[PDB]
Amino acid sequence: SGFRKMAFPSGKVEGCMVQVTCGTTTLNGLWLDDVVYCPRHVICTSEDMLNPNYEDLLIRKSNHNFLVQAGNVQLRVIGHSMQNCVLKLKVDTANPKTPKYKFVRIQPGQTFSVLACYNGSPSGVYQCAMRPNFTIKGSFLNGSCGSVGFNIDYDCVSFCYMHHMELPTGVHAGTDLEGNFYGPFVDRQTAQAAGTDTTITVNVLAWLYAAVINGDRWFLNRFTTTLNDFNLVAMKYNYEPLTQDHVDILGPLSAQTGIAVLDMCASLKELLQNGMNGRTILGSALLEDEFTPFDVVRQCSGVTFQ
Amino acid sequence: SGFRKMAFPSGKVEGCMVQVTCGTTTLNGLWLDDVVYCPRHVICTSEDMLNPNYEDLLIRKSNHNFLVQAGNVQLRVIGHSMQNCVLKLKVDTANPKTPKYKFVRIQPGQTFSVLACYNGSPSGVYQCAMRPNFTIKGSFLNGSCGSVGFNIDYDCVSFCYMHHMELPTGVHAGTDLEGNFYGPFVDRQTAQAAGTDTTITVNVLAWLYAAVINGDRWFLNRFTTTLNDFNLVAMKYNYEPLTQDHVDILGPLSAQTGIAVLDMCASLKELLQNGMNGRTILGSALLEDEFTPFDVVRQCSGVTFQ
Ligand SMILES: [Zn+2]
Ligand SMILES: [Zn+2]
């Protein structure tokens, strides 16, 4: 038993991280097959980032202006092309460590693991959620750009995020692996603001089920409620509204614990109005929303990967 | 910027995990060179665990009673020997993926990463501290035994923990890689109790420095204090007492932020007496103690590994 903020094992992804340099800028890229993916702002200087014209900037770069290093090995760049906000560098050698992989664009509220890298070298791994305003609350220093977020489904790695920038508010923004930003952000150093960061209600509920599985039941209450009455309270507290799809997602957890989704909703409601009162749930004094219903099931049943 | 509970990349350790079976019991082992390390209670049944006589039980087992599987590959057991609470299985084949490694016995308050495995297969990775009562608050299901905890120092993997059991209180206990338990626990299914779980004061202080680095300064106060007066308050709240060694550890963080260790201590004191008052520090409403001063430095400067 017990419950921990768990990340996916990162071995499959460590073998895909390379160091990409263009001019005097160095960041991380992702080496899959004979293509290296990296943030297109690798071709910018600190001054260019204020108002970059990436098309004009890229015209003055040739295949030999890009240095790709796989550890202490040199990859030869034989072709380049810009797709949205990523560069695609075609190299001469296919990565012998390419795993079964796919690209996916995730929805807000989904979770993934981030492998934070510097100079193509892994530094650490952590789990996070995509916030409803399409930012992530990460841990990134200079040179981490091109670090990637991923999920694992048995033997297949689903890449879903590449880090591109830190906003002036200290939160983080990036793209899918096709180069389309999550949210309305652009790869320019300018005052950009994110919308309201709401709590992911369906994830809070999954976590409350995990607490019950692990023996934290004090918050369970004798009331019940309806979807409408609950959503009207939730919205007052900047919680995402719950839909019937979210009720379907929580079905298996409802069956294991014997607690109806709507009964759990009525417990959460009382918590939103009356606070924790100094108590904790699974060692937390705040309501956690970085576990999805799938994550809870995965951890409480012991899924593995190869 | 930002701050996250970060684990070490686990690629180097995923390649060392094997599945060990003896009779009708299956758990994880660690395959390094031509030796497999695993919990000795692999040779027990559910009934044996009540009052095992491991010497007598091991006499009735031969080298061919042990099944070692490296993925879908069979390792031949050519020698076995019990060292404290681990079995050492000498196999015919050396692991081609053995990294530079060492064994270390950590002290309470140190942190490490756990690679949770089931049937020799990685499931996830998380960071935790060794509590002052030599337990860990982990996430382990049946079959996770033999999962390992580790640190990474550039290219060398320091193995420091192997999971052996869950206590009736839901916390977890295990050994170093020589087979000596942390704490006074034994590998028997009996009412075993841990002592008082105190907070790791030196780690709380490191985390408060991290908060200041990242722009959370509200808790900073105008008071100061002495080591003695602070320790007398700490002990009332079941905090570990601070020593001059802990002050030396925090020296570099004190220099970066311009805040004397003792001034930070006086802030913490006020927090212990007057509570958070509903505020948060680095997104937490509780005082975190699972970052060591080294971890904070590592994350706030961007150390990497190969
Ligand atoms: Zn950047
Ligand atoms: Zn066991």
Side-chain angles (χ1 to χ4, degrees), chain A residues 27 41 145 164-165:
Chain A
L27 39 72
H41 74 253
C145 296
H164 282 249
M165 47 189 23

mmCIF file of all heavy atoms in Angstrom, chain A residues 27 41 145 164-165, ligand 1:
data_model
loop_
_atom_site.group_PDB
_atom_site.id
_atom_site.type_symbol
_atom_site.label_atom_id
_atom_site.label_comp_id
_atom_site.label_asym_id
_atom_site.label_seq_id
_atom_site.Cartn_x
_atom_site.Cartn_y
_atom_site.Cartn_z
ATOM 1 N N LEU A 27 21.018 23.367 -26.925
ATOM 2 C CA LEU A 27 19.870 22.831 -26.198
ATOM 3 C C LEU A 27 19.740 21.344 -26.511
ATOM 4 O O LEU A 27 20.592 20.763 -27.194
ATOM 5 C CB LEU A 27 18.596 23.621 -26.543
ATOM 6 C CG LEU A 27 18.381 24.079 -27.967
ATOM 7 C CD1 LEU A 27 18.035 22.902 -28.870
ATOM 8 C CD2 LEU A 27 17.262 25.131 -28.033
ATOM 9 N N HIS A 41 13.992 27.692 -31.853
ATOM 10 C CA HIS A 41 14.739 28.820 -31.353
ATOM 11 C C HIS A 41 16.167 28.445 -30.983
ATOM 12 O O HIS A 41 16.860 29.249 -30.371
ATOM 13 C CB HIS A 41 14.027 29.516 -30.176
ATOM 14 C CG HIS A 41 14.069 28.778 -28.881
ATOM 15 N ND1 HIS A 41 12.964 28.137 -28.366
ATOM 16 C CD2 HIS A 41 15.066 28.607 -27.975
ATOM 17 C CE1 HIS A 41 13.286 27.584 -27.204
ATOM 18 N NE2 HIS A 41 14.556 27.857 -26.944
ATOM 19 N N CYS A 145 15.759 23.540 -22.520
ATOM 20 C CA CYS A 145 14.839 23.542 -23.639
ATOM 21 C C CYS A 145 15.064 22.297 -24.480
ATOM 22 O O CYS A 145 16.191 21.830 -24.656
ATOM 23 C CB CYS A 145 15.014 24.824 -24.462
ATOM 24 S SG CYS A 145 14.589 26.276 -23.511
ATOM 25 N N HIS A 164 9.813 24.503 -24.366
ATOM 26 C CA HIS A 164 10.271 25.614 -25.199
ATOM 27 C C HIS A 164 10.570 26.865 -24.388
ATOM 28 O O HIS A 164 11.568 27.537 -24.663
ATOM 29 C CB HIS A 164 9.245 25.974 -26.249
ATOM 30 C CG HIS A 164 9.215 25.042 -27.420
ATOM 31 N ND1 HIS A 164 9.621 25.426 -28.677
ATOM 32 C CD2 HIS A 164 8.847 23.740 -27.523
ATOM 33 C CE1 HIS A 164 9.501 24.404 -29.509
ATOM 34 N NE2 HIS A 164 9.051 23.361 -28.829
ATOM 35 N N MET A 165 9.760 27.214 -23.385
ATOM 36 C CA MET A 165 10.046 28.464 -22.695
ATOM 37 C C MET A 165 9.491 28.541 -21.292
ATOM 38 O O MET A 165 8.573 27.816 -20.924
ATOM 39 C CB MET A 165 9.462 29.667 -23.494
ATOM 40 C CG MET A 165 8.078 29.455 -23.927
ATOM 41 S SD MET A 165 7.470 30.730 -25.069
ATOM 42 C CE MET A 165 9.031 31.324 -25.716
HETATM 43 ZN ZN ZN C 1 14.776 28.242 -24.713
#
